[PDB]
From Swiss-Prot, chain B:
Post-translational modification: Phosphorylated by MAPK12.
Gene field: DLG1
Superkingdom, natural source: Eukaryota
Family statement drawn from the similarity comment of this UniProt entry: Belongs to the MAGUK family.
Tissue: Abundantly expressed in atrial myocardium (at protein level). Expressed in lung fibroblasts, cervical epithelial and B-cells (at protein level). Expressed in the brain (at protein level). Widely expressed, with isoforms displaying different expression profiles.
Residues of the full protein shown: 317 to 406 of 904
Name by which UniProt lists this protein: Disks large homolog 1
Function: Essential multidomain scaffolding protein required for normal development. Recruits channels, receptors and signaling molecules to discrete plasma membrane domains in polarized cells. Promotes epithelial cell layer barrier function via maintaining cell-cell adhesion. May also play a role in adherens junction assembly, signal transduction, cell proliferation, synaptogenesis and lymphocyte activation. Regulates the excitability of cardiac myocytes by modulating the functional expression of Kv4 channels. Functional regulator of Kv1.5 channel.
Residues with PTM Phosphotyrosine: 83
Domain description: The alternatively spliced domain I3 corresponding to amino acids (636-669) of isoform 4 is an EPB41 binding site mediating association to membranes in polarized and non-polarized cells.
Location relative to the cell: Cell membrane; Basolateral cell membrane; Endoplasmic reticulum membrane; Postsynaptic density
Length: 4, 90
């Protein structure tokens, strides 16, 4: 959902 | 439950999270969850971080009952050295  | 000491690289830390207060990745559960380990990335090279792991904390920043943007901030405002507290499901 959110790449880091 | 685990400790992961990591070095962020060209592609970041190399994985993707979900979840947090108000954006529940599982119903009635605001934990941060690793959803996608990036091929040939820092975590994939390290090998510890597994899919479905729970980020409990990131360096000094605890990711227990935090908003998604709060979590992503914490994982994006960090030097090349990051320690991780995770919880491995059982």
């Amino acid at each position: 959902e959110t790449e880091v | 439950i685990m400790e992961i000491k990591l070095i962020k690289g060209p592609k970041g830390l190399g994985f993707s999270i979900a979840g947090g207060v108000g954006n529940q990745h599982i119903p009635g559960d605001n934990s941060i969850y690793v959803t996608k380990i990036i091929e040939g990335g820092a975590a994939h090279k390290d090998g510890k971080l597994q899919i479905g792991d729970k980020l409990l904390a990131v360096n000094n920043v605890c990711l227990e009952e935090v908003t998604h943007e709060e979590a992503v901030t914490a994982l994006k405002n960090t030097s090349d050295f990051v320690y991780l507290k995770v919880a491995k499901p059982t």
